[PDB]
Curated annotation (Swiss-Prot), chains A, B:
It is linked to Intellectual developmental disorder, X-linked, syndromic, Siderius type: A syndrome characterized by mild to borderline intellectual disability with or without cleft lip/cleft palate. The chain holds residues 116 to 478 of 1060 of the full protein. Fe cation binds at H168, D170, H240. Substrate binds at T165, K185. The lineage of its organism: Eukaryota, Metazoa, Chordata, Craniata, Vertebrata. Interacts with POLR1B, UBTF, SETD1A, HCFC1, E2F1 and ZNF711. Interacts with ZNF263; recruited to the SIX3 promoter along with other proteins involved in chromatin modification and transcriptional corepression where it contributes to transcriptional repression. Histone lysine demethylase with selectivity for the di- and monomethyl states that plays a key role cell cycle progression, rDNA transcription and brain development. Demethylates mono- and dimethylated histone H3 'Lys-9' residue (H3K9Me1 and H3K9Me2), dimethylated H3 'Lys-27' (H3K27Me2) and monomethylated histone H4 'Lys-20' residue (H4K20Me1). Acts as a transcription activator as H3K9Me1, H3K9Me2, H3K27Me2 and H4K20Me1 are epigenetic repressive marks. Involved in cell cycle progression by being required to control G1-S transition. The PHD-type zinc finger mediates the binding to H3K4me3. Binding to H3K4me3 promotes its access to H3K9me2. Belongs to the JHDM1 histone demethylase family. JHDM1D subfamily. This is Histone lysine demethylase PHF8. Residues 116-272 form the JmjC domain. Signal peptide: none annotated. It is found in: Nucleus; Nucleus, Nucleolus. Changing H168A: Abolishes histone methyltransferase activity. The modification Phosphoserine is found at S5.
Length: 363, 363
């Protein structure tokens, strides 16, 4: 029984699973603020039922695959995945649409990475306000910087009944948001504990990965249905698979933030080592980390220069970032990492000062 | 309007509040295991609806105040609190019972710290199995040790309609479990973020504390009703007040554990500084911390000697413990702390080795 097949999907559709109501949070749009995530942390998935309060702009629930073609362009190349084959290829949007409205489910093709920020569709979609407030790339990537900026903020997903993405950790160790405009997507979510990540590493690397459903090798695997109008926020590192049970069109975006930097760095190293992608969807992770380190320094200085105290999560995030900095500039590591260090940053001094301010805020 | 009064209670009974369903977890007895709390962490309150799976032994829901007198003894001294006065006194259990079954609510007296481990009532009550598995004092306090062992594992609470305990952090920075045998207790729970603890410190110390309801000075204050048969587990540090709305008899116990040692140490220092108690309900906190540090060392050694990796939460707990150790044995601090160090412990060496093993498990 191979991961993808109509018999695999058919079994999956029946599968038991641990309820999502156990771990997820279900705030409302207006409740999902920066304070809410600072206080609660962002370590479990978050399903908002209605979009009111999220600050999203979206087309109506009657937008279509054809509307997508209209706004992106028939000729744009798009990555498609063959779901009864788990393999990647380019395809012209037009041919996708041909295939789509045909009904010829002889192949099950799935589109999940159509990034449309440089198309006229960009103007019809605004991402959640929470994401825009948190996002590193959005807030802290400088304009004077001559490194390639990652552009992963807006994706369109068109997914046909019985599509399946297998268990993975997202590129960059990014966090993700998904809004289902129409249809449904079932997410199977597994917590990224050191314990589970080890089983995950082993399973990626396993010789017969394609024959083993990873959610059976772990303690808890949570089924979370994302129906029409609903929005899912998945935290850093969460190992997840996706079954699209009926035709679905969804939107989504990937971001990094300052709430659990240790888990971000961890999710980065692991996804780097296990990824079979030919390209980095998220180039220059380390570059953005460097720039964040200095911003974090400035914040500590500011908080101390005016006799206030930083939140615990940031102190730990800072410490974790600093370790990564030392690790990337050790004499033997430095050649794999040098190219990511922005030319304005004096790493020894950053590390030294970041270390000093962190010592001053420990008990 | 002073904290305690029938007009204060009367207003409280009406008060709006943020729903508890937002932050609490509601597992079942069998789901509440050591793994469950390691994976989920124990950073939000946990309400189990039915006792099945908790491993508790308890008398029936028809046990009474008189049964308590029977098993503890009429003559035992018990701390009582005058709720329209927020003041502490001793009283003979007998006189409490007289007062209790009288119905003379001219004074509102409340019993919340009757510790019955050395009475015949001890044999009728067994605490949850989760607590017994986690508890430092239960598992790691050695018998060869000549320090006074804290005895806070079993409390009986008899609380009359309109009783009120004001907002506090529990002694020792301990975590707490409460089972309501009969009646109800409403808990008003506030997260112990650095942000909220500062407002809390300020409010404790405020000149007119008695006139200000602390749950109005904070972002989020959660009403959590604990009705008959239900069991509440409150985590380290949570600032909470209690309204007993109808007559209630409940049981409970206080424990420390290894899941969030940093917050435990923090909750300790703060509660130490703000407490107006004449005695330490939890003597020798630091002593037990020393012994836990060495056990944690042995675990790191063991995990490394057999090429396995410790869970992140423990690595951080260890690091936080080690800082406290350095802080308590600095040349100038040492005289306030020396007396708590068990004579078998070579602190410089413990700290040095604990520091080394923690370095070996960082990226
Ligand atoms: C790969 N990741 C970024 N995207 C997904 O997990 C979504 C794929 C899907 O919805 O099938
Ligand atoms: C003080 N703490 C340990 N106990 C409480 O918070 C319970 C008091 C009550 O139930 O009124
Ligand atoms: Zn993904
Ligand atoms: Zn308490």
């Amino acid at each position: 029984v191979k991961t993808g097949s109509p018999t695999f999907v058919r079994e999956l559709r029946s599968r038991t699973f641990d309820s999502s109501d156990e771990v997820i949070l279900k705030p409302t749009g207006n409740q999902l603020t920066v304070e809410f995530l600072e206080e609660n942390s962002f370590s479990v998935p978050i399903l908002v039922l209605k979009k009111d309060g999220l600050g999203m702009t979206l087309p109506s629930p009657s937008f279509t695959v054809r509307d997508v073609e209209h706004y992106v362009g028939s000729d744009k190349e798009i990555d498609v995945i063959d779901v009864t084959r788990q393999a990647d290829c380019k395809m012209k949007l037009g041919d996708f649409v041909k295939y789509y409205y045909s009904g010829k489910r002889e192949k099950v093709l799935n589109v999940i990475s159509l990034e449309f920020s440089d198309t006229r569709l960009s103007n019809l979609v605004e991402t959640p306000k929470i994401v825009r407030k948190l996002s590193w790339v959005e807030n802290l990537w400088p304009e004077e910087c001559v490194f390639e900026r990652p552009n992963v903020q807006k994706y369109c997903l068109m997914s046909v009944r019985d599509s399946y993405t297998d268990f993975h950790i997202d590129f960059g160790g990014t966090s993700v948001w998904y809004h289902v405009l129409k249809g449904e997507k079932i997410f199977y979510l597994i917590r990224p504990t050191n314990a589970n990540l080890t089983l995950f590493e082993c399973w990626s690397s396993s010789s017969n990965q394609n024959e083993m459903f990873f959610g059976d090798q772990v303690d808890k695997c949570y089924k979370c249905s994302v129906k029409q109008g609903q929005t899912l926020f998945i935290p850093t590192g969460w190992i997840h698979a996706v079954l699209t049970p009926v035709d679905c069109l969804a939107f989504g975006g990937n971001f990094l933030h300052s709430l659990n930097i240790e888990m971000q760095l961890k999710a980065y190293e692991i996804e780097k080592r296990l990824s079979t992608a030919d390209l980095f969807r998220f180039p220059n992770f380390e570059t953005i980390c460097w720039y964040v380190g200095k911003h974090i320094l400035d914040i500590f200085r500011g908080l101390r220069e005016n006799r206030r105290h930083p939140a615990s999560y940031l102190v730990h995030g800072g410490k974790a970032l600093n370790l990564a900095f030392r690790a990337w500039t050790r004499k033997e590591a430095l050649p794999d990492h040098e190219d990511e260090i922005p030319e304005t940053v004096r790493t020894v001094q950053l590390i030294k000062d970041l270390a000093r301010e962190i010592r001053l805020v420990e008990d």
